[PDB]
Amino acid sequence: GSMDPNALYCICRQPHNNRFMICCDRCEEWFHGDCVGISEARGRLLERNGEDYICPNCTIL
C-alpha cells in the first residue's frame, strides 16, 4: 500500500531515497526510472496527465 522510506520494490530492491522513482498501478509498486528506462522528464509528465504507467516487468508478465 503506502510506500515506505526503508522499503523495497524495484527489481534491484533499493530504497526510494536515492534516485527518481515511478509508481506502477499494475502491480501497485515502485520502480526506478533508470531500471525501467523512463526519464525524469517523462515520469513527471505522466504524473501531470494522470496516465497510469506500467513498468516493463508487468507489461511482459
Contact call for residue 24 and Zn ion (CB under 5 A): yes
Contact call for residue 46 and Zn ion (CB under 5 A): no
Which segment (1-9, 15-23, 25-33, 42-50) binds Zn ion by CB under 5 A?
A: 25-33
Q: Among residues 19, 41, 45, which one has the least CA distance to residue 30?
A: 19
The answer to whether 55 and 22 are in contact (CB under 8 A) is yes
Number of Cα atoms under 13 Å in the Cβ half of residue 46: 16
Which segment (1-9, 15-23, 30-38, 42-50) binds Zn ion by CB under 5 A?
A: 30-38
Q: Which residues bind Zn ion (CB under 5 A)?
A: 10, 12, 24, 26-27, 32, 35, 55, 58
